[PDB]
């Protein structure tokens, strides 16, 4: 019959029979009389499937059975199509499709329906072979959507997938290749259904409970485990690198490459998934901001000096989220900037909705003013926020706490490894005679060895990730976009980059400015959190150390340098001087000539970017001075480190870019007061920097010799570790002082070459002679001569180059008679022989000094010695009144000497009286002065009298 075929197609597809006790797997139908009737066909199908699923047996994998029934159904349709009477069996296949799907929904909607297994086992089977369940699942999803029960489906599937990831796999991470891939495939399959995407954030445990600890966000939250998939997970790093830590560079490189290829696919897939959520609905996209904001808010200690790692989210999780946020931000920050105005500059004019800003230092404002600003500024009920603006500032938040916590973790590892190697080495020396102690020592070695392996492996994995240019480019491009945005916030016109921004914002200030500057800081910029600037700069400095750095040759680099120069040009913008210290350090890395002698990678921008070339020179010379007032402060980003960094840029600008050379000469001729202020500072540091360098170098030797002792004093050995601290500390300070001294002296050389007259005005020329002669005395005498360290280059200590530069300065000023005279009159250091000794020392490094150079230095010294000889002849023959008895302006013997209160100069009462008659000032320093205020110098008056009496007795 044809009533057969249907009956038997049903038998083969559900694998079931009734009388029937022969031939294939099929379960004999137990046991109800209502299904004992030996026909079968279309309307017995519900009954049959209800038997299978509720009545039991060991149908132990009910959901796996459904899928196979569904596969078998698809199979038979295809086979039936090409045979005589496909039509007649159509009603049969439909009913099977209908009900297998239907009950499939039911099985994945309520827990106790079948009496074998539960959600967890059905999901486990699905994860194991997702590609086999995919067509069926897709029908299941569609059926639940059509019957208006999609969320019931999701609340069985997704929380169950949470548990499967935490409890049924030992570690859900990149090592579990099949499993993590199949888990991603499940998310993608569901979330590609639009009606699913719109309610997904309403799944149970999509958000973190109130009591959920930060490390648990990635474990106890629907999206956590997949978001945590990353090569910078310890277990992944150990598997791929800790593997063979002694691998060649070539061999490590292939491992970086597989892990980068894989990590790229993961970010693509995480982004596809989250982008569906974000597009699903306003609810879904708002819930995502909310979800990422909560994670950021509870992870601020990720940037502490010693983070409590075990109480915080992981690097892998936080970096992945940072990259997704970067990726959501890209569109409104592409190079045309046409969407830039979508980001609200007044984002922080209202109290913050998602990001917790409590305790966040602002750019140039305190808690006080900012909270006041909220009050005045407000923004009404509901009113907020705008996804784009939420996303942009969340991205900055993660760059600092997410990525930023990841790079500092990696940065410290070199030192962690070295200390660890040393402790292991010490514990290896212990001779442990007692069995218990011997077990103890080996447990301690083995625990340190494990920590070492973990750290070395992670350093590799983190390096793999930061060398991943394709990923890091996205981060740096975000930074460049963010930079433009921030220049647009500062612009009074809010028009940049469509119109140039005019600097400075406030006229340049000709003793305690902080308050004034804060008061004229721009609004709303001064209230932005410091992290908006700290994030980019920590990232940029750090990522500079990588060959594959996203900064090198990036056409958007300009935007960041622009922002940097703005910030250095306008002290008002960012009050924190360690921040500016980092910024100038970044510019200096850009200025450093490359290994082949070509210009540094920022030189091109410094040259051609109008906003930069108009502002950088002034900015650098101004910052060089301002860092003095660094009240509380400490290295690195010290005033001396900053001056060193500035010197690198100054020197390269002057060598390679004529326009900056001209602006420098211009400042010296047409803005002398600003320029002399820079020079005086440079000059003043150069009075002590070599001393400070030598002194630190001798403290290194004191320390090193205290270590060597072995018979022991202790003459005090405080703590051995405090010595290593004190030894590293003296090494830093030695390098930093000698390094700067070298640079400053070189700046004196190259400038004095072109503008000798800037260096010979009254306020500089005597101080300069005094400083050059003193530094000359160290270099040619025992101060430098008795210094013997190993590798003095370790400490930027090149007494030969410094001597070379110093002597060139003498030469360069050798035709300025004020200088020849200042040098000849400096009784403290000047001595012709210093120049002879210099000539002899310079000739010890062949080629250091030309014969031409040597003759020039000697012509100079000769002129000086001859000026000194003439002076001493003039004084012996015509200097018959001691100098301190002579009026400073009239050159005659004083009758009634008085002291000026501002200058402290002695002057005759009649002279100052004749001065103040027409000009109400101290004639030496221009300070206001009234005649009443001069003070009688009786002691001096008595010397002059005694003196006039001594001479009276001959005449």
């Amino acid at each position: 019959s044809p009533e057969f075929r249907s009956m038997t197609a049903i038998e083969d597809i559900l694998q079931i029979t009734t009388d029937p006790s022969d031939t294939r797997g099929y379960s004999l139908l137990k046991s109800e009389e209502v299904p004992q009737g030996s026909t079968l066909g279309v309307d017995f199908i519900d009954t049959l499937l209800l038997y299978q699923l509720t009545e039991n047996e060991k149908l132990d994998k009910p959901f796996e059975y459904l899928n196979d029934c569904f596969r078998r159904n698809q199979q038979q349709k295809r086979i039936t199509k090409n045979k005589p009477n496909a039509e007649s069996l159509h009603s049969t296949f439909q009913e099977i499709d209908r009900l297998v799907i239907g009950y499939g929904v039911v099985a994945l909607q309520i827990e106790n329906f079948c009496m074998n297994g539960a959600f967890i086992n059905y999901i486990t089977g699905i994860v194991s072979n997702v590609n086999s369940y995919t067509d069926f699942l897709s029908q299941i999803i569609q059926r639940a959507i059509l019957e208006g029960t999609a969320l019931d489906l999701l609340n069985a599937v997704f929380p169950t997938l949470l548990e499967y990831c935490n409890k049924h796999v030992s570690h859900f991470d990149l090592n579990e290749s099949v499993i993590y891939n199949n888990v991603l495939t499940i998310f993608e399959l569901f979330v590609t259904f639009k009606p699913i995407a719109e309610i997904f954030t309403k799944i149970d445990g999509f958000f973190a409970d109130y009591s959920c600890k930060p490390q648990d966000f990635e474990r106890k939250t629907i999206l956590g485990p997949i978001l945590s998939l990353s090569p910078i997970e310890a277990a992944v790093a150990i598997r791929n690198y800790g593997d063979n830590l002694l691998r060649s560079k070539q061999q490590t490189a292939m491992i970086h490459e597989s892990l980068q290829a894989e990590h790229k696919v993961v970010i693509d897939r995480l982004f596809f998934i989250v982008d569906k959520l974000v597009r699903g609905s306003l609810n879904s996209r708002t819930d995502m901001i909310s979800y990422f904001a909560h994670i950021a808010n509870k992870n601020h200690l990720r940037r502490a000096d010693h983070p409590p790692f075990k109480e915080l989210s992981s690097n892998g999780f936080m970096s992945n989220i940072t990259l997704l946020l970067v990726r959501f931000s890209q569109p409104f920050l592409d190079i045309s900037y046409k969407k830039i105005d979508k980001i609200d500059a007044n984002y922080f004019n209202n109290p913050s909705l998602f990001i917790d800003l409590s305790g966040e230092t602002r750019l140039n404002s305190d808690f006080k003013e900012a909270d006041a600003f909220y009050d005045k500024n407000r923004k009404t009920a509901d009113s907020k926020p705008n996804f784009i603006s939420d996303c942009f500032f969340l991205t900055l938040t993660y760059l600092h706490y997410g990525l930023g916590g990841t790079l500092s973790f990696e940065e410290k590892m070199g030192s962690e490894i070295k200390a660890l190697k040393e402790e292991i080495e010490k514990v290896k020396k212990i001779a442990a005679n007692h069995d218990v102690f011997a077990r103890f020592i080996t447990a301690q070695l083995s625990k340190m060895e494990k920590a070492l392996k973990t750290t070395e492996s992670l350093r590799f994995a983190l390096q793999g990730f930061f060398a991943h240019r394709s990923l890091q480019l996205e981060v740096f491009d975000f930074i460049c976009g963010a930079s433009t945005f921030l220049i647009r916030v500062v612009d009074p016109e809010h028009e940049f980059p469509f119109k140039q921004i005019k600097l400075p914002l406030i006229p340049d200030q000709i003793v305690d400015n902080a308050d004034f500057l804060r008061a004229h800081a721009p609004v709303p910029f001064k209230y932005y959190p410091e992290f908006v600037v700290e994030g980019p700069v920590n990232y940029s400095l750090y990522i500079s150390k990588y060959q594959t750095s996203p900064i090198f040759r990036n056409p958007r680099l300009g935007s960041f340098v622009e922002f940097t120069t703005m910030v250095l040009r306008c002290p008002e913008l960012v009050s924190n001087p360690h921040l500016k210290g980092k910024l100038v350090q970044l510019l200096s890395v850009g200025a450093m000539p490359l290994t082949d002698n070509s210009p540094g990678f920022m030189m091109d921008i410094f040259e051609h970017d109008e906003l930069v070339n108009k502002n950088l020179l002034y900015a650098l010379l101004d910052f060089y001075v301002i860092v003095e007032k660094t009240g509380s402060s400490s290295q690195f980003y010290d005033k001396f480190n900053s001056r060193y960094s500035i010197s690198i840029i100054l020197e390269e600008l002057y060598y390679k870019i004529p326009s900056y050379k001209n602006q420098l000469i211009w400042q010296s001729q047409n803005n002398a007061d600003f320029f002399v202020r820079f020079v005086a500072r440079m000059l003043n540091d150069l009075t002590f920097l070599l001393d400070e360098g030598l002194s630190n170098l001798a403290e290194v030797h004191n320390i090193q010799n205290e270590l060597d002792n072995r018979a022991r004093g202790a003459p005090r050995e405080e703590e051995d570790k405090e010595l290593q601290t004190r030894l590293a500390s003296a090494s830093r300070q030695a390098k930093s002082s000698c390094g700067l001294a070298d640079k400053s002296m070189k700046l004196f050389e190259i400038y004095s070459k072109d503008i000798p007259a800037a260096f010979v005005t009254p306020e500089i020329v005597y101080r300069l002679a005094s400083m050059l002669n003193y530094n000359l005395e160290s270099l040619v005498g025992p101060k430098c001569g008795e210094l013997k360290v190993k590798d003095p280059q370790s400490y930027s200590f090149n007494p030969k180059d410094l001597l070379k530069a110093l002597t060139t300065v003498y030469i360069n000023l050798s035709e300025q008679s004020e200088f020849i005279s200042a040098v000849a009159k400096d009784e403290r250091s000047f001595n012709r022989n210093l120049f002879v000794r210099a000539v002899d020392i310079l000739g010890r490094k062949t080629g250091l000094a030309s014969p031409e150079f040597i003759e020039k230095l000697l012509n100079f010294a000769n002129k000086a010695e001859e000026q000194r000889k003439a002076d001493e002849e003039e004084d012996l023959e015509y200097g018959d009144v001691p100098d301190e008895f002579l009026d400073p302006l009239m050159y005659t013997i004083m009758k009634d000497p008085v002291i000026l209160p501002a200058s402290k100069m002695n002057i005759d009462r009649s002279t100052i009286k004749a001065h103040l008659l027409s000009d109400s000032t101290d004639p030496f320093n221009r300070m206001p002065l009234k005649l009443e205020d001069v003070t009688p110098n009786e002691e001096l008056r008595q010397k002059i009298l005694c003196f006039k009496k001594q001479k009276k007795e001959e005449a």
Binding site: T54, I101, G102, V106, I110, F113, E147, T149
Partner: protein, 72 residues
């Protein structure tokens, strides 16, 4: 009208108008035992039934068998 079977067999005939909701059915089934309507699930012909739906909208006629489940 309809018949409601347990897991372990056990039948409970309810007389329903093709108009009352499945919440009204449950409240009737719950009444017919010693439980709350909240503990009752209903499953008919390849789907879980819904509190809002009328017995009519479900495609239930008289003679029909629907699974019920009681809960915690």
């Amino acid at each position: 009208s309809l018949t409601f079977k347990n897991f372990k067999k056990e039948k409970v005939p309810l007389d329903l108008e093709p108009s009352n909701t499945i919440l009204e059915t449950k409240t009737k089934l719950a009444q017919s035992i010693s439980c709350e309507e909240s503990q009752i699930k209903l499953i008919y012909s390849g789907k879980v039934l819904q509190d809002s739906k009328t017995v009519s909208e479900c495609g239930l006629k008289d003679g029909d068998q629907v699974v019920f489940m009681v809960s915690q």
